[PDB]
Amino acid sequence: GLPVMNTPGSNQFLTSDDYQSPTAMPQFDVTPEMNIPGEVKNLMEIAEVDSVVPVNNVNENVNSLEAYRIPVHSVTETGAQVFGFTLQPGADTVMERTLLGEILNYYANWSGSIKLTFMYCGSAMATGKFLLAYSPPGAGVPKNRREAMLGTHIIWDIGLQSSCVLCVPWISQTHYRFVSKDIYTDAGFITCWYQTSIVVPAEVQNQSVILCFVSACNDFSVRLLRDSPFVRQTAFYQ
Amino acid sequence: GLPVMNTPGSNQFLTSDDYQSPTAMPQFDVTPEMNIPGEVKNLMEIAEVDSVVPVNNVNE
Amino acid sequence: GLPVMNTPGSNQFLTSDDYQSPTAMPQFDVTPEMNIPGEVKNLMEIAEVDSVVPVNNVNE
Amino acid sequence: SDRVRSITLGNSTITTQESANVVVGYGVWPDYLSDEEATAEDQPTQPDVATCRFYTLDSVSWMKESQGWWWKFPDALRDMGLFGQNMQYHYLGRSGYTIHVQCNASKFHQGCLLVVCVPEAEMGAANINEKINREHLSNGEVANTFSGTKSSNTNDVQQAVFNAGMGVAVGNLTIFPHQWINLRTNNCATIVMPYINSVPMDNMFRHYNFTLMIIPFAKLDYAAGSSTYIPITVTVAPMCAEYNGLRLAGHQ
Amino acid sequence: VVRVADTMPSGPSNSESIPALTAAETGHTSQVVPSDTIQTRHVRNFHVRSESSVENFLSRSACVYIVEYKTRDDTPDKMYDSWVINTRQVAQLRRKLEFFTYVRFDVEVTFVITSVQDDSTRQNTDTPALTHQIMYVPPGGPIPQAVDDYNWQTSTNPSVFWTEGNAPPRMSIPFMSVGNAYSNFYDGWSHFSQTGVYGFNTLNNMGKLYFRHVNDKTISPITSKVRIYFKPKHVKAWVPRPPRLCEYTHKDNVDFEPKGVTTSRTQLTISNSTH
Amino acid sequence: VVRVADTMPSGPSNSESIPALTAAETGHTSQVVPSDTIQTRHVRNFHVRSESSVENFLSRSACVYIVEYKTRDDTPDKMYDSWVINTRQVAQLRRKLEFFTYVRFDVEVTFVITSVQDDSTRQNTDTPALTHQIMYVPPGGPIPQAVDDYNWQTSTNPSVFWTEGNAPPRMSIPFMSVGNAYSNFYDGWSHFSQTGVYGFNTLNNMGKLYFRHVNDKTISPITSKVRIYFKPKHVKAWVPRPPRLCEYTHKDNVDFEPKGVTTSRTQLTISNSTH
Amino acid sequence: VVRVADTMPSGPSNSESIPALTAAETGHTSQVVPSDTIQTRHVRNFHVRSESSVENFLSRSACVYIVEYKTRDDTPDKMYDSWVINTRQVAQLRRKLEFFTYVRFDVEVTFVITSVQDDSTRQNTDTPALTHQIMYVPPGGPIPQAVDDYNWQTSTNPSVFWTEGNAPPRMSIPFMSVGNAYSNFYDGWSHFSQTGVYGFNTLNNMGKLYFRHVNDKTISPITSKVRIYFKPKHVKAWVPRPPRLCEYTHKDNVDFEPKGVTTSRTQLTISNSTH
Amino acid sequence: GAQVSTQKTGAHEIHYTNINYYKDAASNSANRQDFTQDPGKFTEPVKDIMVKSLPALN
Amino acid sequence: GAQVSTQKTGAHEIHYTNINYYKDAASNSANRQDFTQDPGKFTEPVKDIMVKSLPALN
Amino acid sequence: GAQVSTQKTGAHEIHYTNINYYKDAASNSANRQDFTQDPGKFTEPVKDIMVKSLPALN
Numbered sequence A: 001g002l003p004v005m006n007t008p009g010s011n012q013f014l015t016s017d018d019y020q021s022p023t024a025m026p027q028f029d030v031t032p033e034m035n036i037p038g039e040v041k042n043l044m045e046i047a048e049v050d051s052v053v054p055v056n057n058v059n060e061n062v063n064s065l066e067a068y069r070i071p072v073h074s075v076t077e078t079g080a081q082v083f084g085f086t087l088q089p090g091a092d093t094v095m096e097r098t099l100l101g102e103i104l105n106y107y108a109n110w111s112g113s114i115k116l117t118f119m120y121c122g123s124a125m126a127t128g129k130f131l132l133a134y135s136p137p138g139a140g141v142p143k144n145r146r147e148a149m150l151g152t153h154i155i156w157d158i159g160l161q162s163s164c165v166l167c168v169p170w171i172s173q174t175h176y177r178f179v180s181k182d183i184y185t186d187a188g189f190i191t192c193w194y195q196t197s198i199v200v201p202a203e204v205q206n207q208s209v210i211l212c213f214v215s216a217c218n219d220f221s222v223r224l225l226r227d228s229p230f231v232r233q234t235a236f237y238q
Numbered sequence B, C: 001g002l003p004v005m006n007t008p009g010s011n012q013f014l015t016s017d018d019y020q021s022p023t024a025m026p027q028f029d030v031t032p033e034m035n036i037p038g039e040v041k042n043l044m045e046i047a048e049v050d051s052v053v054p055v056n057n058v059n060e
Numbered sequence D: 001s002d003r004v005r006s007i008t009l010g011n012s013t014i015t016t017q018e019s020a021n022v023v024v025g026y027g028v029w030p031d032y033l034s035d036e037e038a039t040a041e042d043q044p045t046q047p048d049v050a051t052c053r054f055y056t057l058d059s060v061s062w063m064k065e066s067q068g069w070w071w072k073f074p075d076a077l078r079d080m081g082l083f084g085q086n087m088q089y090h091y092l093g094r095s096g097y098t099i100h101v102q103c104n105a106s107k108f109h110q111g112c113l114l115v116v117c118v119p120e121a122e123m124g125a126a127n128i129n130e131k132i133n134r135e136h137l138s139n140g141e142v143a144n145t146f147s148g149t150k151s152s153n154t155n156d157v158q159q160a161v162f163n164a165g166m167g168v169a170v171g172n173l174t175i176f177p178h179q180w181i182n183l184r185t186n187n188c189a190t191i192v193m194p195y196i197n198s199v200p201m202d203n204m205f206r207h208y209n210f211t212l213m214i215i216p217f218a219k220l221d222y223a224a225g226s227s228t229y230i231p232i233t234v235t236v237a238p239m240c241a242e243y244n245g246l247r248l249a250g251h252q
Numbered sequence E, F, G: 001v002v003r004v005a006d007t008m009p010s011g012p013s014n015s016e017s018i019p020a021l022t023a024a025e026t027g028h029t030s031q032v033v034p035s036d037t038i039q040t041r042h043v044r045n046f047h048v049r050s051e052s053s054v055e056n057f058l059s060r061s062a063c064v065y066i067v068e069y070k071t072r073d074d075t076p077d078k079m080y081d082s083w084v085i086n087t088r089q090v091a092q093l094r095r096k097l098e099f100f101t102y103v104r105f106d107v108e109v110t111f112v113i114t115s116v117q118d119d120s121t122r123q124n125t126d127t128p129a130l131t132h133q134i135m136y137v138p139p140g141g142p143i144p145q146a147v148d149d150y151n152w153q154t155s156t157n158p159s160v161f162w163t164e165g166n167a168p169p170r171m172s173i174p175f176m177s178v179g180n181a182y183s184n185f186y187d188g189w190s191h192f193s194q195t196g197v198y199g200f201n202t203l204n205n206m207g208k209l210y211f212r213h214v215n216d217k218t219i220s221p222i223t224s225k226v227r228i229y230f231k232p233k234h235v236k237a238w239v240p241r242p243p244r245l246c247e248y249t250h251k252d253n254v255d256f257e258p259k260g261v262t263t264s265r266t267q268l269t270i271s272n273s274t275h
Numbered sequence H, I, J: 001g002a003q004v005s006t007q008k009t010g011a012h013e014i015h016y017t018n019i020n021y022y023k024d025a026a027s028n029s030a031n032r033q034d035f036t037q038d039p040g041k042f043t044e045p046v047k048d049i050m051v052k053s054l055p056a057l058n
């Protein structure tokens, strides 16, 4: 017949093969196709939906619904820290099991901006202000409100519109970070401070609750497939 | 010769194969074809004929 | 299938091969390319630079 | 302003004055089944006034220690008029819905509900190798209740808020068509929900299409002189309901 | 060739426009770009959402089960093996499929067969090459009950024969569901009186595989272990849902023990101290 | 691309037209559509009678016989084997062919050969690879009577040689009948005086196969068992007939013991009781 | 088709032009042609700088490491092996890459696997063909800790399976860096306070390979030794630098002992005597 | 000498390539795409055909 | 019956050839070059859409 | 989808054929026929260039 020569890689099985193979059931009439609402063409469509962040994961608050509640109240002087975490969507314990953290934990590189949305769930007669700061690394963690307003921040006034958006800008050396932890691609710190206190009238509760949301912007990407570090089985599922 | 690479499924026998194979009798003169009444092109032609139903299949 | 015949040199590994092989990571998005000064296209660009000659290599 | 909304379906009308918006499914508005996606061959039944109208379920009481509630929804309307009768006489049903939830307070009360509408909420069991009775997955117009901790009742759903009965993170449960009832801005939450299934028509007793879930993230809280009793009322209206395969009444 | 969105330049602003103020109570995710809050430059961005599509995310071969059978035994049931087909006994491919509720895909099936000589007194043999047979039975067909049973003839059932040392066997399989999608979750019963079994176990109904050695009784036992690899291709997927927090228990139900939402921190505010 | 018939819509009727009243005494099957009796809607139906055609129904490989022979024996007849070619010793392919009276098809023949080391005292050998020979003899040719016989030369007869471990051997065979179709049933005699043999055994006359090992006497016995797979392709079929109720007995005749028409019910009317 | 420069003819000269007088203090290499100093003829030169380009100089397969593992042991860690991927443990490919500071290339990886029967009392066996598995783990993935560990499933990780006696396994690998080039040298620290590790060890981060036998515990030990061959193709290279005089010591740093600049002569002027 | 024809796909949502390699027509693959039928010789096998609305044995 | 299409290359700096060999569409390779999306049914799933500068719940 | 280009022959005394078979550009063979160069950035890397006959530091 035709003279041919075998190259290396012959008769192997690669998991990421893209070849053609014969059908075990020839001329099989496949059932017709139906329009079903909610078709997904990209996991990045899923990752752009807001979802609630468990910021209060502190020592057995995870076995309840109290892990989602950020406690806030009237203060004595001013200018204290409300909460704080590190911008690691997939390595930080705060946004680990969040939807962006799940999809990013099926990947190894990520890139693009991140929206943080904060909903005030207190009463209609209560007022307050906050400073929602982002600080790129190189220094450490800002230790007061004076060091926190030297970076990217926003003052949020609580009124009729009940939610604010801190859109974390993509500021990086490279084009991609790593999803797991390394010293080279460190991203910064999300922190929140009292601009003014929570002033409330009489016969109204003082202590209220902030909820937090996260999603990705329209310039977001993920690059390298891997297995998620969350799957741990020992035997089969008989 | 020509560099090629073998995929999985090589050198197997599937019952529903649809390949080409050489003839054991080359240039064999097949006998002519005759019009015979009652040619079937589909078993669904057969299944559309009425046939009697044994409804009274009761104990012998 | 197609009748073919294997030549000598089949199933060997030559160090100076120039063939095609499948990717272990399909559709991998390679990072963009940046203009960096001092691109080399030939070692003969390097060999045409003057460099100092140790003529006095005499006993330590 | 756009906070006032009025919805008319049949001889029933809802007027709200502190609405937020209306979420419509995955963008798709509920319509009838076309001839290209059809499977069955006979003429369907389209009542369109005696069926497509608002039905009001039971009100539930929201204390400071309330955890959540759920309703299965082709089954909570089993005994609701000619919708339930048309469920009882036909074999194949197909409809979309409009889910409106009422909860009111004053400007001195605080709290925040999450109203989710989850397709195919196949729930877990309290004891793992045990069979769940049907009275605990659904109870009709009577709500089932989540618990704060690990529940271990017999033949019952695993009732924990932080897993939503499905084994997932409850914070990630906003991928579904949802709204919030925040008591400082909102009064109600309207969700238009189309027909979602793997088959064009289905039986409305053997299958559970979706599950409404109302879970309070921010707990209810008020002062020592305010009103204590705060109800939560769910109202549902089928949309574009049609029926196929008429036979005698029953489910067995 | 579909790029991500460019970053457009902006300047100072002072007006009644409020992109950062919104209302998340309407179920709406805000479309806020970083050029709406801070001053940004012009960035021509060339990134492509390529390796995150539903085709590239699922189309990877995954081990679904291990099948073990021998070549000579005292009992005839240990000389052949069978497997009711599901994708829900290995947690990786199960959790990758359970991002969605309904799916529609063709399957690409690859078998990897290895044989090990069992421990015996007469290990010094010269065994000719073992040949294996993998028969697929569509739901309802007759079942072989021995290795020498006459139901192994494969007159109509699909089959594949593999000699030891070749490439792994591979065949393609079309979309085989009686409905319009493989239903990953079924919230419902099997009987119309709402009894029976609860879950997706009513809608499996995919058939089952069978494994034996085409060779006869050998004079020394050899244990074959064949691994089945599914590859979902030609993928469509609908109505997404959150990933599972909890560890699985069984294949037939969805039941669990409750798990905490995430890992604890033991504090709530970061600092430049030991964090 | 041939679809099934669409279902057309209908309304109420009151007239002297009677589609449901007919007469089955004329040998006529009524062409009644469901839109003739009840009110139907418009259904655009996309089903295709594709996997029910006579080509797709018969063109599947089926085991027709098992052939056994050895490599060293005391008697020379057990070192080779022969088979007179028919399709009527396995009931599945026989019952699939006997839907029709006459057929016309090309054949695709595949052999699957396996060897097993027989039990002996000297099993510790090192056997080189066995090579098998399958010779087809057209009707009338000379017959080999030993493994070393000189009629195994295959100067004119078709043959195939297979080394152990390769793919199964496959060759194509044209339509070989002296008439215009393979007669599945022959109602008639062999002699003109209406004696002799009665049935299709006069019209078989297809030749016969022969099997041996090309290797010589080995120092240990090995039993080869080769399985013949026919595949009817390029199929035409005429004058259908009902399937066989009764179990077969022999290959040469059509005889049987009488069998009941179907399974009994023990009652005649259904109910909501234990039925 | 790019030739070298032709040699042009010249004659006598007497003028104020000075091609031979220049100044090397400006960092400038003089462009003096032999037709500027002496009388030359016309030479039509057909030489091509073809086998000196950066593509032809680097695109050769080079052994980067040897990996050893066994098939039965008392300790489970000697039945499998692992290798953190670098190009800096063999001096030939390292010194060929370190002509430049930054490089950008696709990789072509070839494995050469050989097995040797270890010394034991029961060497008289009959071992079926060994099958090897090479799993690549991108940085961050889970690590197998035994040969029977369930992390060898390769649902998402790239893998390759090789049966003994075939061609060597070969796959292609794209440019995998998070920056714009593989940095051969990194002058800097890992921590922002200028502590940690100093050198290119921060920027390796390429993943690591894993090696085992797909077969189970055999009844005699066999030592496999697999050799990894990298081939850099599609090559771009920037900012060259002098070759290394000194012998290497380690893979992680660049440290050395001082070496003399060249070989000594013991005299400084040549002669027709014993030189 | 190549022939291009459509593949068996589903409805509501191809073009393989075939070259024959042997000198005989008995070597060709199976003709698995002939989907035509005519049940007019098994159903309706009568003289003086029936019009399905008439009493037909009127 | 060949089809020519571009390869996945990087930016700032092709044309493979494919022929289908089997009669069925379930034998074809994976469609790994469909990069389109539409998150308008998951984000922004509302009636009376919002204009991102208005108070929107004004 | 074939590409024809000349072979490496000697002077004073061809046309191979290449078809790419894989969907990725990292599978292609080595580009061993780019023979261009520019030593103007390593030799002559100066401002106010020199004219080789002038004293040049005159």
Ligand SMILES: CCCCCCCCCCCCC/C=C/[C@H](O)[C@H](N)CO
Pocket (backbone or CB within 6 Å): A024, E085, E086, E087, E097, E103, E107, E109, E134, E135, E136, E158, E159, E160, E171, E173, E176, E182, E183, E184, E204, E206, E209
């Ligand atoms: C021997 C040749 C045929 C080989 C048969 C192997 C597998 C046959 C079944 C096709 C695979 C379908 C697997 C299940 C698909 C879906 O994921 C599940 N139904 C749940 O979604």
Ligand SMILES: CCCCCCCCCCCCC/C=C/[C@H](O)[C@H](N)CO
Pocket (backbone or CB within 6 Å): B024, F085, F086, F087, F097, F103, F107, F109, F134, F135, F136, F158, F159, F160, F171, F173, F176, F182, F183, F184, F204, F206, F209
């Ligand atoms: C060794 C190479 C040639 C292999 C010869 C094998 C078989 C030769 C005979 C052709 C097969 C015809 C089998 C019988 C066909 C019809 O079904 C029967 N006559 C009854 O219908």
Ligand SMILES: CCCCCCCCCCCCC/C=C/[C@H](O)[C@H](N)CO
Pocket (backbone or CB within 6 Å): C024, G085, G086, G087, G097, G103, G107, G109, G134, G135, G136, G158, G159, G160, G171, G173, G176, G182, G183, G184, G204, G206, G209
């Ligand atoms: C099992 C299939 C995949 C095989 C994986 C083998 C190697 C994977 C890594 C790609 C090779 C990159 C090697 C290093 C390249 C550069 O020279 C270094 N970063 C330093 O320049």
